[PDB]
Amino acid sequence: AKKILVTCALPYANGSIHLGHMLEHIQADVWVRYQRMRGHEVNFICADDAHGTPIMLKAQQLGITPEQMIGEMSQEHQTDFAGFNISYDNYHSTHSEENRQLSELIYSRLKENGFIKNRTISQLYDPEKGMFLPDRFVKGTCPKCKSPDQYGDNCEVCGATYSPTELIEPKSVVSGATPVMRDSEHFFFDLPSFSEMLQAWTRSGALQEQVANKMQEWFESGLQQWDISRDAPYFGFEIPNAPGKYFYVWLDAPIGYMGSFKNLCDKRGDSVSFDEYWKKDSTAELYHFIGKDIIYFHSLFWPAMLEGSNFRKPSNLFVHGYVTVNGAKMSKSRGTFIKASTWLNHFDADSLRYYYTAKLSSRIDDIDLNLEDFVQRVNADIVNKVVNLASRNAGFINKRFDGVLASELADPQLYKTFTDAAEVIGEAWESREFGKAVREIMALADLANRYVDEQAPWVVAKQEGRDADLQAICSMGINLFRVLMTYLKPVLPKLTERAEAFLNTELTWDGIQQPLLGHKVNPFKALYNRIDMRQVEALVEASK
Numbered sequence: 001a002k003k004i005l006v007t008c009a010l011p012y013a014n015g016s017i018h019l020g021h022m023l024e025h026i027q028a029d030v031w032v033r034y035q036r037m038r039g040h041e042v043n044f045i046c047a048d049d050a051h052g053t054p055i056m057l058k059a060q061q062l063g064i065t066p067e068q069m070i071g072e073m074s075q076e077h078q079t080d081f082a083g084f085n086i087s088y089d090n091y092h093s094t095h096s097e098e099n100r101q102l103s104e105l106i107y108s109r110l111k112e113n114g115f116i117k118n119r120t121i122s123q124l125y126d127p128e129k130g131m132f133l134p135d136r137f138v139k140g141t142c143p144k145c146k147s148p149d150q151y152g153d154n155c156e157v158c159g160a161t162y163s164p165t166e167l168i169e170p171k172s173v174v175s176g177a178t179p180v181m182r183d184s185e186h187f188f189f190d191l192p193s194f195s196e197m198l199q200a201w202t203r204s205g206a207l208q209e210q211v212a213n214k215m216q217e218w219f220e221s222g223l224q225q226w227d228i229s230r231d232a233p234y235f236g237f238e239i240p241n242a243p244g245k246y247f248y249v250w251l252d253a254p255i256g257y258m259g260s261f262k263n264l265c266d267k268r269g270d271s272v273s274f275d276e277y278w279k280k281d282s283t284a285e286l287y288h289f290i291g292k293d294i295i296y297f298h299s300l301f302w303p304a305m306l307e308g309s310n311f312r313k314p315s316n317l318f319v320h321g322y323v324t325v326n327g328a329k330m331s332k333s334r335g336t337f338i339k340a341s342t343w344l345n346h347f348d349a350d351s352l353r354y355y356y357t358a359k360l361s362s363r364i365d366d367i368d369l370n371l372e373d374f375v376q377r378v379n380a381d382i383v384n385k386v387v388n389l390a391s392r393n394a395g396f397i398n399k400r401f402d403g404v405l406a407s408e409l410a411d412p413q414l415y416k417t418f419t420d421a422a423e424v425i426g427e428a429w430e431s432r433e434f435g436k437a438v439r440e441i442m443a444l445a446d447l448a449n450r451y452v453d454e455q456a457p458w459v460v461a462k463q464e465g466r467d468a469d470l471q472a473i474c475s476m477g478i479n480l481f482r483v484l485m486t487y488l489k490p491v492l493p494k495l496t497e498r499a500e501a502f503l504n505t506e507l508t509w510d511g512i513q514q515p516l517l518g519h520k521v522n523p524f525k526a527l528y529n530r531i532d533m534r535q536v537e538a539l540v541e542a543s544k
C-alpha cells in the first residue's frame with residue numbers, strides 16, 4: 001500500500017474558478033479516486049494562493065481588508081470545487097500560520113546554506129502612493145508608435161515590446177502620479193547552484209518528455225538568480241530580520257502545499273505523517289498536477305528550494321495543456337469564458353468530468369471543449385451506451401421478477417471478457433492515459449449493448465413461457481453495467497452513487513470478480529437524462 005500526496009496548483013484568490021481550473025482539478029480528482037480504489041493511502045491537497053500586490057490593491061479598491069476578500073474568495077472557490085465533487089482531503093490557504101512558519105524555515109535554511117544573496121536593484125516607484133510598481137501598474141505612451149494609454153512592457157496597438165522605463169509620460173495605474181526610478185535591496189535565491197542537480201532530474205525519464213524538452217531550453221538560456229523579495233506595502237509574509245521586506249508570493253506559494261498538508265496533519269492530531277511525507281528519506285510519493293504556464297516554478301525553483309532546505313523533492317510533475325472552447329482560447333465576447341459556477345447552473349458536474357476525461361492523455365497538449373461535440377458525446381456515451389444497459393433492463397427485473405437478478409450468469413465468457421479488461425483499464429488510469437481508458441470502456445459498452453440486441457429482450461418479453469430467458473438476459477446486462485460503472489467510478493461520482501443505490505452495492509475494483517447473483521436491485525428514476533444544444537446556447541448567453 002502506497003502513501004501518495006497529490007496536489008493541484010493553488011488558485012489565486014483574486015478571480016473566480018473557470019473551466020481552465022476545472023480541467024486540472026478534474027484530472028487530478030479522477031487519478032486520486034482511482035488510487036483510492038486500488039487501496040492506497042492518498043492525501044489530495046490544495047489551497048488558495050492568497051498573497052501579492054494585485055490582491056492587496058484589489059482589497060484596497062473594494063474598501064475591505066485583504067483578509068476579508070481572500071476569505072470570501074476561498075469560500076467561493078471551495079463551493080465551486082465541491083459542486084464538481086473534487087475530493088480534497090484538505091483545502092487550506094497560503095495565508096496561514098503553517099505556511100508562514102514553513103516559509104520562514106525554508107528561507108532560514110537556504111540562507112544558512114549559502115543560497116541567499118543580497119543585491120540592490122532599480123525599479124519604477126510611485127512616490128505619491130509610496131510603492132514600487134510592477135510593470136503592469138505602469139501606463140504611458142508607446143515610444144515607438146506614440147499610442148497613449150498602454151500598459152506594462154508592450155503596446156496593444158503596434159505590438160512593440162519595451163521596458164516600461166521607455167514609456168513616454170509614464171503614469172502610475174494606482175495613483176496617476178509620475179513614477180521615478182528608485183533603488184531597493186532585494187534578496188535572491190541562487191538557483192544556478194542547483195543546475196547540475198536539476199539537469200540530472202531532467203534526464204532521469206520521470207518527467208513528461210515535452211516538459212524535459214522545455215527544461216533543456218531553459219538550461220540553454222541560462223539559469224539566473226531569482227528575486228524572492230518585495231518591498232512594503234505588500235500582502236504577504238514579512239522576511240525575518242529584514243524590516244519592510246516580504247517574501248514574493250511565488251516563494252511562499254508552493255510552500256503552501258506543505259502548509260496545507262501540515263494543517264491537515266495538525267487537525268487530525270497526527271504528529272508523524274508530515275515528516276513521513278516531507279523528510280529526505282521519505283518512501284511516500286509526491287505528485288503535483290499543474291498547467292504548462294507554471295512549469296518553471298515547479299521544475300526549477302521548487303526542487304531546488306526543497307533540496308537546499310533538506311526536504312524531499314517531487315516524485316513527478318504531471319503537466320496538462322490549456323482548455324480551449326470551440327477550438328479557441330476562451331473568449332468573453334463570445335461567451336466561452338465560462339465560470340465553474342455558471343456551468344453548474346446549466347449542466348451537471350459529471351458531464352464535464354466525462355468529456356474532459358475522454359480527451360485527456362499523459363501529454364501536455366491542449367484540451368478542446370467543443371460544445372456541439374459535448375452534447376453529442378455525453379448523449380451517445382453516457383445515456384445511450386452505459387446508462388442504457390441499466391435503463392433497458394431494470395424495468396423487466398423490477399416489474400416481472402420482484403427486483404431479483406438471476407442465480408447464474410447467462411454468458412460467463414462475455415462476463416470474463418469484461419473483467420479481464422480491468423488490468424489494461426487500470427493501467428490507463430494509472431498512467432493518466434484517460435482517453436485510452438474511456439475508449440476501452442466504451443468499446444466494452446458497445447459489446448454489452450450488442451449482446452442485449454442479439455438476445456432481443458423486447459421480443460422475448462412478449463413470448464409465452466420465456467420468463468426465465470428474459471430474467472437471464474436482463475440480469476446479464478445489469479452485471480455488465482456493474483462492471484462498466486466500476487471502471488467509470490473515478491470519472492462519474494454522482495452517477496456512480498445513483499448506480500450503487502440501484503444495485504444495492506458499493507462498487508469496488510475487486511468486487512467485479514463476484515457478479516450479482518440472486519440479488520435484489522432497487523427501482524430508479526432516470527439515472528441520466530439527455531442534454532441538448534438549447535442548453536449550450538443558454539450557457540454561452542449567460543456567460544457573455
Ligand code: MET
Binds near residue numbers: 010012
Ligand atoms: C503553488 S501553485 C500557484 C499557482 C498560481 N496561483 C497560479 O494560478 O498560476
Ligand SMILES: [Zn+2]
Binds near residue numbers: 142147159
Ligand atoms: Zn505602439
